[PDB]
Design a protein around this ligand. Structure first.
Ligand SMILES: *[C@@H](C)[C@H]1/C(=C/c2[nH]c(/C=C3N=C(/C=C4\NC(=O)C(CC)=C4C)C(C)=C\3CCC(=O)O)c(CCC(=O)O)c2C)NC(=O)[C@@H]1C
Lengths: 162, 172, 162, 172, 162, 172, 172, 162, 172, 162, 172, 162
C-alpha cells in the first residue's frame, strides 16, 4: 500500500540507498498532519451511520428513477438499496483509511482499481456516488484542518468518478 | 509493502470495519514517537559507512579465515560484495525501523537469503556475526543523547534491535 | 535539482497526475523543518571563513605530511593549501545549499557526481576532507534542530567520502 | 527542474556565493507563505475534474465548430485528447505553483507546444481560451475562503494567474 | 484503419512477405459477406432519420429523468435533445461505416477510442446509448444475413458500453 | 495451436500419409457445419458482456460471501479480476468452438488453472459455478433460432456444452 | 493504412455524413470486381521471384555498370539489397492492389525513398527502370487468361499499372 | 500450425478479445474456398504415385548429370533416386495438407523451415525441385478453381525455392 | 571460461600462491605445443561443413528410422536442428581444443544436454553416434601430415579425442 | 572492415578503454603471420589469370551441362562463361584481400554477405564454386605456411558455400 | 572502420583490382614497423592516466578561469567530463596509431565535436590546448628509448603527432 | 577469466561460429610473446620476497605518517604492516598471473573489480600502492622484452589506481 512512509522507502530502495533527509522531512510532514487526519477519521467514523443513511437518501432524492426503475441494477428494491448503502459506506470507510495512513493508497487499491470496469459492467452511475460524497462533505460537520483532510480525500474520490 | 498504519488498515479492511478509537489512539502513540523514530533512522543514515566498515573490520579480525586466499571474502570483488550485503541489511533494517513494521525487510531482503548463502558457500554464521556487530554499533548510536533532546527511547531501541535480530536469524 | 518539492512534482508527473495529499503533506514537512534548516544555513554562512580556516588547519595538523611532502598535489605548497581551503569552502557552501532547499540535491549535483574520479585522478585523499568535515561538525556551535540539520548534511558528505 | 529555492541556489553557485542574509530572508518569507500556497494547490487538485470539464463545456458551447465533423475536437479520440491537454496544462500550472517557479511548466510543457498545435491543425487560439477559462475557475476557487482561515492571498493568486497566462501565450 | 484487408496486409508486411493463399481466401470471405453488409448499410442509411428519431424517443421514455432533470448534460433543453439525437446518429453512422468496411474499425477509431473518458467526463450514461442501440436492432426491418450483419455491429457497440 | 483440420494433418504427417478419402469426407462434413459454427460463435461474441455479467450476478446472489469484506471477490480490483476470468474462459471456449477442438482451451487456459486458484485462495467450486452459469446462458443463446435459418444445431450445441464442462472441472 | 472501403468512410466521416448513393454504388462495384482483383494479386504472389529476378536480369544486362566493381549493385551484399528493394516495391504494389488504395505503398514504402537513394548514391533512374520491368512483367501476367474464367480486366490492369507508376516516380 | 482458424484465434488471444467479425469473415472465406481445395487435394492424392513418377522423370531428363554422377547427392545411385522421389512425394503431400487446412502452414512448418539449410548442407539444387513442381502443375489435369488452388500452393513452393 | 593457463592461475590463487617453477615449465611446454594445437583447430575449422555433413550422412544411412516420417530428424526444421546440434558440438570441441581445457565445453554446451534430449524425445544414443563419427573424421584429419611440417602430434590428437568422448558421454 | 586490428579497436572502444596487452599481442600475431600471408597473396595474384582459367575449366569439365545448357544462368554461352570466369576471379581476388588484412573480413563483406540470396535468386550452384576453389587449392603450388594461409581462406570460402 | 591494410583493400576493390606488387611491398614495410608501432601504443597505454592528468593540471594552471565557479570545468561532474573527454581523445588517437590510419579518429571522435563544444559552451581553444599538452607528453614518451631497443622511430612519432593535430584542429 | 584465448572463443561463440584464421593468428601472437612473459613471471616470483619487502619499506619512507599515525588502517602496528606487505604481495602475485595468462584478466578479476570500494571503505590510499608498484618496476632488474612484459602489467595496476 502506498503511504508517505512506504513510498519514501520504495524510492530509497529503488536507488539502493538509505533514506534521504528530504525523505525524513517528508515523513515528518505526515507525522505533523496526522493529528488533523486522525481527528477527521474519528469523527467520520462516529457519525458513519447517519452519514451513510443521509447520503443514500440524498442520492434517492436526486436520482428518483434509481429507486423506481425495477431491475437488478437499481435500488428499486430492499437488496438494491441495501447494496447502495453498503457501497456508500465502503466509500466512507476508504476515506477514513486514507486519513489514517495519510495518503490515497487504501482508496486507490481497495476501491479505485477496477472501479471503471465494475461501474460499467453493473451499470452503476458514477454520478450517484458523486452525489453521496458531496452529501458527506456537506454533512460531516468537521472544522479546521480535520475538515480539510476529510474533504481532500472525499474530493479525490469525486475526481476518480468524473 | 506496509508500514504500521497500513498494516492496521489492511486487517481492518478484510474485516469490513472502521478502525476503533483504541486503534486510532494506538496509532496516535506511534505519531507521538515519530520524532524519536526519525532520530534513530537519521543516526543510522548519518553513520552508515562507519557502522558497516567498523563492523566488517571486527568480523575480519575475529575471523581472518574469511579473507585469507580462498576464503569467501578474499579478492576485492568478494570483499566488496560482503560490504554491500552488510549495507543492504543495514538499509532494510532502517526501512523496517521508519515503517515500524518488519514487512519490507522480511519480504524484499530476508526471504530466501538463508538458501542464497548456502548456495554460494558464504558462511551464514559469519554473516549473522556481521549483522550483530552492526546492531551493537547502531543501538550504541541510538542510546547516544548527544544531538537530541534527552529522553527515553528504550522502547524504540528495543524495536530496532528486533529488526536486526530478524535479519541475523534469517541468514543461517 | 532534487528537492522535496521537485521530487514530489517529478513523481506526480511520472504518473500523469496531480500531486496528491500525501505529497502536499511531504512538502509541508519540508516547510516545517525549514526554520531550523535556514538557521543552520545563516550561521554556517556568517562563520564560513572561521570554519574553513579551522577545518583547513585541523587537516594540516592531522596529515602534516601533506604540508610536508611537496609537489603540486600537496599542502606543502601555496597553491596546494589555497586549493585545499577552497575545496573545504566548497563543501561548506554546498552544505548551506542543501539546508536551503531541504535536500542533498545541490551537494549531489555540484560535488558528489564525479567525486571519486576527481579524487582518484588528482590523488586527493577522501580522509583529508572527512577530517575537515568532522572539524566543522565540532566547531559550528549550533544547537537544537539547527545543529541536527547541519550535522546531517555534513555527515552525508562524510559518507559520500567513505 | 527547479523550485524557487533551488533556483536561488543555482544562481548563487554559478557565482560561487553563499546566499545572502537578504536572500535567506526572502526564502523564510516563502516558507511562511507555504500553508497558503499548499491551500491553493489543494483547491486545484480537489476541483481538477470540474475546472477542466466545465471550462471545456464552455469552450465547445462558444466554439461549436470544434466538435462538429471535421472540427479538431470531433470523435471521442480527439475530444479525449483535448480534455487531456487541458488537464496537462492544469497539472503543470499546479506544479509551477507548488514550486513557486515556472521552470517545470516552461520546460516540460510549454516548450514547443505552439509548434505542435500548428503542425496538428489544432487552433491555438481556442486552446488559449480553454486555458483562460481554467485560470478563471482556478483563481475564483483560490479566492474563496470557505475551508481556510480568512486571510490575504492576493500575492499567491496573482502569481497563480501569471502561470496560467504563460501557458495561454505559449500555445499561440 | 483496421479492416479485413488492411489486417491481412499488416500481417504479411510484418513478416516481410507477399500475401499468401490463406490471406486472399480470407479477403474473399469478406467480399462474400459484403453483399449482406452493403444491403444492411443501404437500408440503415435510407432509414437513418426514422431510426435516430425513433431511438431518441425510446431513450426519453425509458429514462424520463433526462428529459426532466434540467442541467447541461440532459435532454432537458432543446440543445440537449438535439445533442442526444446527434449522438445517436453518430452511433448509427458508425455502424454503417463498419458494415461497409467489414469491420469494427470505424467505430473503434471514431467513437470507442476515448468513449470511457468522454462518458465519464460529461456524465453521459452508457445505458442511454444501449437503449438507443436496442431500439435500432428492433426497428431496422432487415432480415436474413443483412439483419445478422447490422445486429452484429449494433451488439458490438452495446458490448463496448457494458 | 491446432484446429480440427490441422489436427488430422499433423497425425497424417507423422505417419507419412496423405489424408484418406474417408478423412477428406469427414472434413468436408465439417466444412458443411461452418455457417452454423460461425453463428454460435457470433452469438457468444454478440452477448459476451451479458453472458459474463448476468452469470456473475447470479453467482454473487447465490454466494454472497464472495463479495463481502474478506471474500475473494471483495474490492473492485478482485471483482474486476473475477469478471475478467469469466470472460477469459468464455473467450477460450469460443476459440475451441471455432477450432472445433478443445486444444487451445486445454493448453492456453485450463492446464494449471486448478493450482493457480488453490494458490490464490480463490474457491474453485465457485468458479465452476460461474462457468456453469455462462454455459447455460450460451447454450440457450445457441439454441435460439431468432436471427438464424431454422435448423438443427444439436451436435454443435452439444460440442459447445462439452467445452464449458471441461473448463468447470479444470478449475476445481 | 486505408483500403478503398476505409478511404470512402474516412471522406464521409470528415463531412459527418452517411455514405452517398454514389459512394455505396462504388463500394458495391469494388465487391463485384473482387474475385478478379484477387486473381491479379495471386498472379503477382505466384510469380514474385520470377518477376523480381527476370526484371533484375534485364536491368543488369541493360546497365552493366551497376554490377561492375564500384557499381551500386556490386558485391553480394549490395546485389542482395537491390533485389530486396525490388521485392519490397513488388510487395507493396501488391498490397495497394488488394487494398484498392495506394496508402500502404505511399506511406510505408515510397515516402522519403527518393532522398534515401540520393543519400546512398543509388541511381534512382535505374531503380525506376527495375520497377518498370516488374510492372511490364506483372501486367503481362495479369492479361494472361490461362487459369481464369475469360473476361474483361482492363480497369483492374490499368489500376495495377498505376501503382507501379507511383512507385517509379517516387524513386527519382 | 497456421490455418485461417488458428491464425484468427492466435490474433484474438494476443489482444485478449473475442474473434472479430473480420476474423469470422476470414473463416467464412476458408469455408467457401474449401470445396475447390478438397477437390484438388483428393485428385492430387489419388494421382500421387503417377505425379511423383512423372516429376522425378522430368527432373532426370532436364538434369542428365544427376542421374549419371555416382555420388551421395545424385540420382546416379539407387539411394539418390529413391530419395529424390521420396522428396518429391513430400512436396506433393505437403501441398495436399495446405489444401486441406486452407493455408501454407503445413508446408511452412514441415518443409520450408530449415529448407535453405538442408539444400545447402546436402548440396541439393533448388532448381531440381522447381522442375518437379512445374511438372506437377502441368500434369495434375485439374481445372477451374480446384486447379487454381493446387497451382497456387505449388507456386508457393517454387517461390520458397527461388 | 578458463583456458589451460587460467585454470592453473585460478587454482594457485585459491591457495594464495605463486606458480612454482615446475608449473611454469608445464605452461612453457604448452606454448611449445602451440603451433601444432593451432593446426588441429584449423583442420577442424577448415573442414567443419564436411565433418558435420558427412557424419550426419553416415548416421542417417545406418539409422534411416530417424529421418522417415515420425522420426526425430524428419521435416527440414528437425533435420536443420540435428545438423545445428552437430555443428554446435564440433564448435565447442574445437574451443576446448584451442583452450586446452574442457571448461567452455562442459559449461556452455554439455551441462544439461542429456536432460534436454530426454525431454525432447531425441535419442541420445544416436547423438553419441553422430559425435563419434565427427570425432573419427576430425582425428583422422588431425593425424594427416598433408599441409603441416611432418611431426608428432600424438598427445594433442589424444586430447582432442578426449573432448569428443566427453561430449558423446554427456548426451546419453 | 574486420581485421585483427579493427577488431581490437572496436572491442577497446566498445568498452571505452585503451587496448590492453592482450590485444597488442593479438596484433603482434598478425604482424608475425603476415610474411606468410603476403607471400601467398603475391603468388596468387601473379598466377591469377592461369588460376582463374583453369578453375573455370575444371568447373566446365565437372558440370558439363552448364557449358551445355541454354539459358542466361549457364556458362553455355560466351556471356555465361564470361560471368563464370568473372565470378571465379572475384573469389580469388577476395582471398588475396583476406591474406592482406590478415582476416576474413573482405570476403565476409564483399562476397559472403548476401551469397545465399544471390545463389538462390540467380540459381547458381554453390557446388560449381566449391569445385573452382578446390582447383585453386590444388594448383597454386604454394608451399609451407604460405600454402597454409592461402588454403585456409580458400577452405573458408568452401565452408561458406556448404 | 579501416586500418591501413583495409584501406588499400577497399580502394582496390572499388577498382576491381588485385593489389600491385608495389602496394604489397609498402604493406610489408608497415609490417616491419609493427613492433615499433606497438611500442608507441604501449607507451601511451602505460602512461595514460599521467598523460591525461598532468596535461589537465597544466591546462588549469594556465587557465584558472576554467575551474572557478561559473567556469566550464567547475563542479566535479564537469571536471570529470573534461578529464573523460581528454581520455577519449587520447584513446582514439592511440587507435589511429595502431590502425595506422586516421579514419577511426575522424569517424567516431572528431566528427561534429567542434559543434558539440560550441553548443555546450565549452571553449574549443582550451580543449585544443589540452590536446596539445597530451601530444607533447606522448611524443616525449615515444622518443624515450628506455625499455626499447635503441632505434629510429622518427616516422612513427611524426605520424603520432599528426593524429593529435587532427584532433586539436577539429575541436575549435 | 579473460585471456587472449578465452576472449577469442567468446567472440566466435558470440557469433555461433568456429574461430577463423584471424583469431588463430591472434592466439599465435600470445604464444610468441609468452616466452618473454614466462621469463618475467619466473623472475618476479623467485625475487618476490625481496621485492615485496623492499616495496613496503619504500612506501613507509615516502609516507611516514602510516608508520607513525595510529589506527588499524595505518601500519602504526605490526598488523597494519603485515597487511601492508600482504597487499603488496597480492599485487605482485596478480602481476605474475597476468604474465602467465597473457592478459590483465587475473588482475582485473581478483584485485581490480571492487578496488575503488575497498580503498574508500578501508581508507587505503591508492598512492601507497603506486609507490610500491613503482619500486617493483625499478627493482626487478629484468631486461629486454621480459622487462617490457613485467612493466606493462605493473603500469596497468598503476593506471587502475589513478
Ligand atoms: C444453430 C447454430 C442455430 C441455427 C443456425 C443455422 N445457420 C444457418 C445458416 C447460415 N448462417 C450464416 C451465418 C454466418 N456465416 C458467416 O459468414 C458468418 C459471419 C461472417 C456468420 C455468423 C450463414 C451465411 C448461413 C447460410 C445462409 C443462407 O441464406 O444461405 C443454418 C441453415 C443451414 C446451413 O447449415 O447452412 C442454420 C440451421 N439454426 C437453428 O435453428 C439454431 C437456433
Amino acid at each position: 500500500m502506498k503511504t508517505p512512509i512506504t513510498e519514501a522507502i520504495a524510492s530509497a530502495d529503488s536507488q539502493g540507498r538509505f533514506l534521504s533527509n528530504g525523505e525524513l522531512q517528508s515523513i515528518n510532514g505526515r507525522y505533523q498532519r496526522a493529528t488533523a487526519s486522525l481527528e477527521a477519521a474519528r469523527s467520520l467514523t462516529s457519525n458513519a451511520e447517519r452519514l451513510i443513511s443521509g447520503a443514500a437518501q440524498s442520492v434517492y432524492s436526486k436520482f428518483p428513477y434509481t429507486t423506481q426503475m425495477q431491475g437488478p441494477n437499481y435500488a428499486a428494491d430492499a437488496t438494491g438499496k441495501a447494496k447502495c448503502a453498503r457501497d456508500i459506506g465502503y466509500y466512507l470507510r476508504m476515506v477514513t483509511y486514507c486519513l489514517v495512513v495519510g495518503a490515497t493508497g487504501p482508496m486507490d487499491e481497495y476501491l479505485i482499481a477496477g472501479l471503471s470496469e465494475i461501474n460499467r459492467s453493473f451499470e452503476l452511475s458514477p454520478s450517484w456516488y458523486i452525489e453521496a460524497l458531496e452529501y458527506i462533505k456537506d454533512s460531516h460537520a468537521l472544522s479546521g484542518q480535520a475538515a480539510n483532510e476529510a474533504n481532500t480525500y472525499l474530493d479525490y474520490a469525486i475526481n476518480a468518478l468524473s | 509493502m506496509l508500514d504500521a498504519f497500513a498494516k492496521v488498515v489492511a486487517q481492518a479492511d478484510a474485516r469490513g470495519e472502521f478502525l476503533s478509537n483504541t486503534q486510532l489512539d494506538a496509532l496516535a502513540n506511534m505519531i507521538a514517537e515519530g520524532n524519536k523514530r526519525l532520530d534513530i533512522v537519521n543516526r543510522i543514515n548519518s553513520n552508515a559507512s562507519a557502522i558497516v566498515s567498523n563492523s566488517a573490520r571486527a568480523l575480519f579480525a575475529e575471523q581472518p579465515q574469511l579473507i585469507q586466499p580462498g576464503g569467501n571474502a578474499y579478492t576485492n570483488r568478494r570483499m566488496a560484495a560482503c560490504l554491500r550485503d552488510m549495507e543492504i541489511v543495514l538499509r532494510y533494517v532502517s526501512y523496517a525501523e521508519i515503517a515500524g513494521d518488519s514487512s519490507v525487510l522480511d519480504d524484499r531482503c530476508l526471504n530466501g537469503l538463508r538458501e542464497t548463502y548456502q548456495a554460494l558457500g558464504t558462511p551464514g554464521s559469519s554473516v549473522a556475526v556481521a549483522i550483530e556487530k552492526m546492531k551493537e554499533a547502531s543501538v550504541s548510536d541510538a542510546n547516544d543523547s548527544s544531538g537530541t533532546p534527552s529522553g527515553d527511547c528504550s522502547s524504540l531501541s528495543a524495536e530496532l534491535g528486533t529488526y536486526f535480530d530478524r535479519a541475523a536469524s534469517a541468514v543461517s
